[PDB]
C-alpha cells in the first residue's frame, strides 16, 4: 500500500493484477528501535 | 477487395450513342457510389458522372449535362453511363470507380476506392 | 518400482522411493480453458472467408494445441479488421445471405471490430481429423463457425471461450538434427 | 447534469491475452448435449502423466541394445526438455510452448527379450558440477542411482529429482554454450547373459510435482 | 478528481442485431387502446402448426391423380423445405430465413372422390443409403409407412420423422450435389375401384417438435 | 422482452423509452394447442 | 473461469454472451488419479 | 438507452507519480517464496538511524587530529546536509532527494588513542545570528555545548537541535549566499596530555525526530 | 526501427529476366505491406508493385502488369519482385518500402515508412 490514493475496490481479481506470493521481518526497524538512549554512569542535573 | 468489370466501349463516330457499364466483384451490403471518369488524350483524369446505390442521386459534369445518362439495376448490382450525341472530343479513356468509404452528395466526385482498368472510347469526325 | 508394463497401467514413481519429497505443484497455467483463451491469428483472410479453426498455424500456441486433440467444443470472439462493414452468417447459410444486412452487420469504428460469436455447428462436437466424407485431408463442409463479408479484410483474430478438448493426439517439438540438445539464443539484457 | 469521467491515456488498447470479454451480437442459442462425452481433458499435464512416450537414441529406434564389448554406458542425455533424445516425446511437445518448468520426471524401462535372456541394468542421475558424464558404472555408483535386473515385471520406473539452485529452470537450452545447466542420465549395463541381440525400451512421462509455469509461442510461423 | 475509464477498442460499433437500446426524444405518449384484439400470433411455428397449407405436384396441381396404369407411384419429393413440391408451402416460406431445423413434419392427405369411388393407398418414408427411390410398394413396404383406404373420414395425417446423424439439418441444399441429406417421401397407390379421375389433396404442416434455429437474411435484394 | 440482453434497468424512465398502452389473448397458441392428436376408432397394436 | 479477471459481473445476460447448453465427466484426471505408486514385492530400507 | 457520460477535459493524461494502477495482461502466476528473508528495510530512515557513516575532514580524512599549537579549534562545519564535511555521508545521499526537512541530527565522536593518551574535547552548536563562528572555546562556551574527556568508554554521541523560524528546512543551499541558514557546529580541544598524533573519529546519523519530506529528482541526468 | 535489405540488381539487356528481393532486420509480428518504387534516370520516384503479408494481396502499376510477378516467404520473411521480358525504359533505380502503419488494399501504393537504399538496375538494347 504505497503511492495508490484511490478508494474503490480494483476492477481486476487480484490473481491478474500481480503475482501471488507464497510460503514455506523487518531487521532494520528492530535494530533502529532497539538503539540505546540515556545516559551511562550517573547524572548530576 | 472488390474488382470492377467494366463493358461496351469500343469506337464510333459522331452522333452515335455508347453504353457503358460496370459490375463490381463481391455484393457487399454497402452504399457505394459508382463513378465514371476519362482521361483525354495527354490529358489528365476528370470526373464525368456519379450515382449513389441506395437511391438515383446522380452527379454530373458541366461538360456532359444533358447528354450522358447514369443508372442502376439493383437486381443485376450493375451501372451503365449512357453516352448520347457524342462530340468528337469525347475521345478518353473511361474509367469507372467505387467510394466506398463516404456517401454523401457534397463529396460525390473528389475521393473513389477501386478504380477498375479503363475502357477505350474513340469517337470519330 | 516395478510393474508389467505390457499392460500398460499408469505408474507414478515418486523422489520417495529414495528419500526425497514431493512438493506442492500448482498446474493453472496448463488448463485447457486457460491457455486456449488467447488471440491468435489467421493469416489467410478474404473478402470472403469462413472462420474455420482449422486454418491457425500449425505450429502456433493454440493452433498447436488445437491439432493436439480429436474432437472440441468452443465459442468464439474474432477481431476483424476491415472496410465498409462486416456481415456475420452462421453455420448452414447460403453465400448469398453475406450481402444483405438483415444478419449481423457491423458499421465499422475506427481501430477494428470486437464480437463474440456463438457455436451454431450442427454438431455436438466438431474435430480436427475425419475418417471418411460426408457427400454422396479435408474434413466436412460443416465443420465451421460461420463466414464474415468485407470489401477487404486486412487480418482476422480468433479466442476460444468454453474451450473443452477430447481425445488426445501427438504433439511435437522442433526436431534436433546433430546437436546434444536443441540451443536457441535467449533474451539477456544488453551489455 | 451527467457524470463526468476522464478517458485515461494508456489504457483502452487490445492486448492479446487480456482478461475481458467482447459484446454478443446473437442471442438465445442452444448447443446439442455432449453430457458425457468419452475423453476429455481439462489439464495437458494429466495426459502427460498418464501417457508416457517413447525416447529416441542413436539411429532413432525408442530402445537401448546390450552391447557384446567392454563398454558399460548404453546411453546418456541432458535433463533438458530441449534434449536430442526427447525431441520426439509430448512432454517435450507441450514443453516447447512454456517458459520455465520445476518438478520430477519419470522415466520408464521395459525390458523386450526374451525368457531365456538375462540383464542388470543401472541409471544414475549426474547433476552439474563435473566437465564430462562418467562413463562406468563404478565411477557413476557415487551419485543418485538405482539397480534392477530382468524377471517377471518387465518395467521399471525411476524418478529424475529436481535438484537445482533455483526454484524454476528454464525448458529451453540458451546458446552453443556448453555443459547443460542440470545434469545428465546415464544408462548402464551391469550385466548380462546370453542376450546379446535383445533390447530395453525408455519412455518418459511427467511426476507427481511436475509444473510448467509461463506461456509462450515461441515457433517461427 | 473524477472517475477514470478505459474507452475499449473494438467494442463499440453499431452491429444491427445487437441486444441494447436507443436513447428517447419524446416522452409520455400514450397509445389507442387495442385490448382483445383478434387474430394475434405470437410464434410463426404456432400459424405454421395450425394452417397447413398445399404442396405442388405436376402441372402445379395440389393433388395427385390415380392412374390408368402399371404404375403405383404417385409422386415421390425430397425430405427438404426446399424441394420442388414445397416451394408453395407457408412452412417452406419460413424456413428460408433460417439456417437449422430439427423435428416432426406432419402431412395430410385429403380424399376428394365421389361416394361410389374407393381406393387404398400408402406413404412411406426412405431415409438416405440408398441411390434411388423405390418405385413399387411392394418394395419400399420395408420403409416406415403407412396404409389407409377410403371411407367416411376423408382425411389422413402421416408424421415425417427426424432421423439423422447430426441434431440439426440445414434448410438449404448447398450444391447440385445429388442424393438429398434426408430421404424421400413416396406416395403409393395400393389399388383403386371406379377411381379414374379422382384425386387426393396433400398439404403439410408443422409438427409437435419442429423447430427452427438460427435467423438469417438470404434472399437477393 | 424480444432481443434485450442487459441485466442492468434502463438508464431512462419508461414514460420516455417508449409510448404507453392503455387498456378498456394469443389466437393462434390456443388454436395449435387445441389440435387433435391420437387416433380415431379402435387401435389393434 | 479460464482467463477471465474481472470481479465485477456481466453487463449482458448469460442468454446472449455465449449458447446454452443442454443435457440428456474427465477421463484423464482419472486415469492420473488412478496411477499406481509405492513399491512392488518387499522392500529393505 | 444507456448511461451518458462527459469526457471531461484536463483529466485523463499520464503523470508519471500518480495514484492509480494499470490494467493486467498475464494472470495467474505464483512468485517463489521469500519467507524471512535476512535484512529487509522498509523505511530510508531506519537504516539512516541504526548506521552512522564518517564525515570528510581536510585531506578527506574520517577524523581530526589533536594540535601541537595555541589553536584549540579542531573542525567546523555548517548545519547543512550539503556542506563540504558531510558530502560522501549516507544522511547526506538519501537527503539529496528531497526538498525539505526537520528533526535532530546526531554526532558520534571515537578516540582512537592509545592508553597512555587523555584529552579533553567540546562541540558547541552555533545558531545563526553571528557574521563569524567563534574560535575559542571560552567564547563558545555561551551556545549549547557539552564537553567530555577520554576513558573507559571511547565514544560519545551529541545531538543537534533542530531550532530555527519555519517548521521545515531545505535541505539544499540556495546560492552563493553567505552565512548559512542554520547553524555552525564547532569542535574544540579543551586539554589533552600527551596526545600529539592521536585523532578523533566523527560519524553522523538521523535522530528520534528527523524527517524527510518532499520527494524529487535534482541531479543532471 | 526497422532496415530493409535488398538484393538482386545489376544489368542485364532487353528480353532477359531479374529478380530482386528485401528483407526486413526485425521479423516483429506486424502486417506490413512490401512494396518497390522506382526512379527513372531524370525523372521521379514511382509505384510499380506491392505485396501483403498475410494474403498473397498484389498491387501493380499499368506499366508492369503481364510482365512483372510479385510474390512472398512467409518462412524465410522476404519478398521478390521477378522482372519478365525487360523493356529499355525498364532501366531505373529501384526501391523497396515498408507501410507498416496501415494495410488496406485501396491505400496500398501511397504511403510508406521504411525504405532502405536503392539498387540499380540498368538494361541495354
Known amino acids: 500500500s504505497g503511492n495508490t490514493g484511490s478508494i474503490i475496490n480494483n476492477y481486476y481479481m487480484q490473481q491478474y493484477q500481480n503475482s501471488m506470493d507464497t510460503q514455506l521481518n523487518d531487521w532494520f526497524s528492530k535494530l533502529a528501535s532497539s538503539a540505546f538512549s540515556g545516559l551511562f554512569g550517573a547524572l548530576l542535573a | 477487395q472488390v474488382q470492377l468489370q467494366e463493358s461496351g466501349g469500343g469506337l464510333v463516330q459522331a452522333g452515335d450513342s455508347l453504353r457503358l457499364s460496370c459490375?463490381?466483384?463481391?455484393?457487399?451490403?454497402?452504399?457505394?457510389?459508382?463513378?465514371?471518369f476519362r482521361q483525354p488524350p495527354g490529358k489528365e483524369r476528370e470526373f464525368?458522372?456519379?450515382?449513389?446505390?441506395?437511391?438515383?442521386?446522380?452527379?454530373?459534369?458541366a461538360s456532359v449535362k444533358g447528354r450522358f445518362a447514369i443508372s442502376r439495376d439493383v437486381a443485376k448490382n450493375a451501372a451503365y453511363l449512357q453516352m448520347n450525341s457524342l462530340k468528337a472530343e469525347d475521345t478518353a479513356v473511361?474509367?469507372?470507380?467505387?467510394?466506398?468509404?463516404?456517401?454523401?452528395?457534397?463529396?460525390?466526385?473528389?475521393?473513389?476506392?477501386?478504380?477498375?482498368?479503363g475502357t477505350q472510347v474513340t469517337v470519330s469526325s | 518400482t516395478t510393474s508389467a508394463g505390457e499392460s500398460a497401467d499408469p505408474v507414478t514413481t515418486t523422489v520417495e522411493n529414495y528419500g526425497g519429497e514431493t512438493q506442492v505443484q500448482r498446474r493453472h497455467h496448463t488448463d485447457v480453458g486457460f491457455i486456449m483463451d488467447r488471440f491468435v491469428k489467421i493469416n489467410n483472410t478474404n473478402p470472403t472467408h469462413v472462420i474455420d479453426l482449422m486454418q491457425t498455424h500449425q505450429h502456433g500456441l493454440v493452433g498447436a494445441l488445437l491439432r493436439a486433440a480429436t474432437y472440441y467444443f468452443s465459442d468464439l470472439e474474432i477481431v476483424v479488421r476491415h472496410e465498409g462493414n462486416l456481415t456475420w452468417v452462421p453455420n448452414g447459410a447460403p453465400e448469398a445471405a453475406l450481402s444483405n444486412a438483415g444478419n449481423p452487420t457491423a458499421y465499422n469504428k475506427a481501430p477494428f471490430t470486437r464480437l463474440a460469436l456463438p457455436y451454431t455447428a450442427p454438431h455436438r462436437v466438431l474435430a480436427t481429423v475425419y475418417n471418411g466424407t460426408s457427400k454422396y485431408t479435408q474434413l466436412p463442409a460443416s465443420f465451421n463457425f460461420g463466414a464474415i463479408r468485407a470489401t477487404d479484410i486486412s487480418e482476422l483474430l480468433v479466442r476460444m471461450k468454453r474451450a473443452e478438448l477430447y481425445c488426445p493426439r501427438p504433439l511435437l517439438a522442433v526436431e534436433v538434427t546433430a546437436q546434444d540438445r536443441h540451443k536457441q539464443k535467449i533474451i539477456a539484457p544488453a551489455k | 447534469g451527467i457524470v463526468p469521467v476522464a478517458c485515461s491515456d494508456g489504457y483502452g488498447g487490445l492486448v492479446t491475452t487480456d482478461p475481458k470479454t467482447a459484446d454478443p451480437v446473437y442471442g438465445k442459442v442452444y448447443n446439442p448435449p455432449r453430457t458425457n462425452y468419452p475423453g476429455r481433458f481439462t489439464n495437458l499435464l494429466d495426459v502427460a502423466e498418464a501417457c508416457p512416450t517413447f525416447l529416441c537414441f542413436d539411429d532413432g529406434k525408442p530402445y537401448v541394445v546390450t552391447r557384446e564389448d567392454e563398454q558399460r554406458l548404453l546411453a546418456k542425455f541432458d535433463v533438458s526438455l530441449a534434449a536430442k533424445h526427447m525431441s520426439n516425446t509430448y512432454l517435450s511437445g507441450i514443453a516447447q510452448y512454456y517458459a520455465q518448468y520445476s518438478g520430477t520426471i519419470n522415466l520408464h524401462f521395459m525390458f523386450t527379450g526374451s525368457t531365456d535372456s538375462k540383464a542388470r541394468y543401472m541409471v544414475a542421475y549426474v547433476p552439474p558440477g563435473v566437465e564430462t558424464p562418467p562413463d562406468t558404472p563404478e565411477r557413476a555408483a557415487h551419485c543418485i542411482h538405482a539397480e534392477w535386473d530382468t524377471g517377471l515385471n518387465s518395467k521399471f520406473t525411476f524418478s529424475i529429482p529436481y535438484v537445482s539452485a533455483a526454484d524454476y529452470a528454464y525448458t529451453a537450452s540458451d546458446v552453443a554454450e556448453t555443459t547443460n545447466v542440470q545434469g545428465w542420465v546415464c544408462i548402464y549395463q551391469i550385466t548380462h547373459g546370453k542376450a546379446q541381440n535383445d533390447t530395453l525400451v525408455v519412455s518418459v512421462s511427467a511426476g507427481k510435482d511436475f509444473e510448467l509455469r509461463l506461456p509462450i509461442d515461441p515457433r517461427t510461423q | 478528481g473524477i472517475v477514470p475509464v478505459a474507452c475499449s477498442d473494438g467494442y463499440g460499433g453499431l452491429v444491427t442485431t445487437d441486444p441494447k437500446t436507443a436513447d428517447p426524444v419524446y416522452g409520455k405518449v400514450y397509445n389507442p387502446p387495442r385490448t382483445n384484439y383478434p387474430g394475434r400470433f405470437t410464434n410463426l411455428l404456432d400459424v405454421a402448426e395450425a394452417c397447413p397449407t398445399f404442396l405442388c405436384f405436376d402441372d402445379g396441381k395440389p393433388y395427385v391423380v390415380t392412374r390408368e396404369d402399371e404404375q403405383r407411384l404417385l409422386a415421390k419429393f425430397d425430405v427438404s423445405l426446399a424441394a420442388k413440391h414445397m416451394s408453395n408451402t407457408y412452412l417452406s416460406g419460413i424456413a428460408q430465413y433460417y439456417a437449422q431445423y430439427s423435428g416432426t413434419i406432419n402431412l395430410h392427405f385429403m380424399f376428394t372422390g365421389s361416394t361410389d369411388s374407393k381406393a387404398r393407398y400408402m406413404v412411406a418414408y426412405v431415409p438416405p443409403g440408398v441411390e434411388t427411390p423405390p418405385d413399387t410398394p411392394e418394395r419400399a413396404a420395408h420403409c416406415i409407412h403407412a396404409e389407409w383406404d377410403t371411407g367416411l373420414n376423408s382425411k389422413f395425417t402421416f408424421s415425417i420423422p427426424y432421423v439423422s446423424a447430426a441434431d440439426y439439418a440445414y434448410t438449404a441444399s448447398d450444391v447440385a450435389e445429388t442424393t438429398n441429406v434426408q430421404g424421400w417421401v413416396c406416395i403409393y397407390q395400393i389399388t383403386h375401384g371406379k377411381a379414374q379421375n379422382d384425386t387426393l389433396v396433400v398439404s403439410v404442416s408443422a409438427g409437435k417438435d419442429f423447430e427452427l434455429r438460427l435467423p438469417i437474411d438470404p434472399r437477393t435484394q | 422482452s424480444g432481443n434485450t440482453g442487459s441485466i442492468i434497468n434502463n438508464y431512462y424512465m419508461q414514460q420516455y423509452q417508449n409510448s404507453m398502452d392503455t387498456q378498456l389473448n394469443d389466437w393462434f397458441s390456443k388454436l395449435a394447442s387445441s389440435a387433435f392428436s391420437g387416433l380415431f376408432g379402435a387401435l389393434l397394436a | 473461469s479460464g482467463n477471465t479477471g474481472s470481479i465485477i459481473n456481466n453487463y449482458y445476460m448469460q442468454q446472449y454472451q455465449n449458447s446454452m447448453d443442454t443435457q440428456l465427466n474427465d477421463w484423464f484426471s482419472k486415469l492420473a488419479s488412478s496411477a499406481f505408486s509405492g513399491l512392488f514385492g518387499a522392500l529393505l530400507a | 438507452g444507456i448511461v451518458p457520460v462527459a469526457c471531461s477535459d484536463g483529466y485523463g493524461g499520464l503523470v508519471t507519480t500518480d495514484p492509480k494502477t494499470a490494467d493486467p495482461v498475464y494472470g495467474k502466476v505464483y512468485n517463489p517464496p521469500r519467507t524471512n528473508y535476512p535484512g529487509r528495510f522498509t523505511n530510508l530512515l531506519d537504516v539512516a538511524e541504526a548506521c552512522p557513516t564518517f564525515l570528510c575532514f581536510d585531506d578527506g580524512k574520517p577524523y581530526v587530529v589533536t594540535r601541537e599549537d595555541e589553536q584549540r579549534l579542531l573542525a567546523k562545519f555548517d548545519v547543512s546536509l550539503a556542506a563540504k564535511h558531510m558530502s560522501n555521508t549516507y544522511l547526506s545521499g538519501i537527503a539529496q532527494y528531497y526538498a525539505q526537512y526537520s528533526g535532530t541530527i546526531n554526532l558520534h565522536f571515537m578516540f582512537t588513542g592509545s592508553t597512555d593518551s587523555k584529552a579533553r574535547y567540546m562541540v558547541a552548536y552555533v545558531p545563526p545570528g553571528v557574521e563569524t563562528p567563534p574560535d575559542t572555546p571560552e567564547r563558545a562556551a555561551h551556545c549549547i555545548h557539552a564537553e567530555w574527556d577520554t576513558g573507559l568508554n571511547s565514544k560519545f554521541t551529541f545531538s543537534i537541535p533542530y531550532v530555527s523560524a519555519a517548521d521545515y528546512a531545505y535541505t539544499a543551499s540556495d546560492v552563493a549566499e553567505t552565512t548559512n541558514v542554520q547553524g555552525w557546529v564547532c569542535i574544540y580541544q579543551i586539554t589533552h596530555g600527551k596526545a600529539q598524533n592521536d585523532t578523533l573519529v566523527v560519524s553522523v546519523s538521523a535522530g528520534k525526530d528527523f524527517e524527510l519530506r518532499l520527494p524529487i529528482d535534482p541531479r543532471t541526468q | 526501427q526497422v532496415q530493409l535489405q535488398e538484393s538482386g540488381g545489376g544489368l542485364v539487356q532487353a528480353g532477359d529476366s531479374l529478380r530482386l528481393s528485401c528483407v526486413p532486420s526485425?521479423?516483429?509480428?506486424?502486417?506490413?505491406?512490401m512494396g518497390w518504387f522506382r526512379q527513372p534516370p531524370g525523372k521521379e520516384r514511382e509505384f510499380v508493385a506491392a505485396?501483403?503479408?498475410?494474403?498473397?494481396?498484389?498491387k501493380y502499376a499499368a506499366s508492369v502488369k503481364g510482365r512483372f510477378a510479385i510474390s512472398r516467404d512467409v518462412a524465410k520473411n522476404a519478398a521478390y519482385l521477378q522482372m519478365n521480358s525487360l523493356k529499355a525504359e525498364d532501366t531505373a533505380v529501384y526501391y523497396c518500402?515498408?507501410?507498416?502503419?496501415?494495410?488496406?488494399?485501396?491505400?496500398?501504393?501511397?504511403?510508406?515508412?521504411?525504405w532502405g537504399q536503392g539498387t540499380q538496375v540498368t538494361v541495354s538494347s
Open positions: 526485425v521479423r516483429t509480428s506486424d502486417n506490413y505491406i
Open positions: 505485396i501483403r503479408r498475410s494474403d498473397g494481396t498484389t
Open positions: 518500402a515498408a507501410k507498416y502503419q496501415s494495410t488496406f488494399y485501396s491505400t496500398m501504393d501511397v504511403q510508406y515508412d521504411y
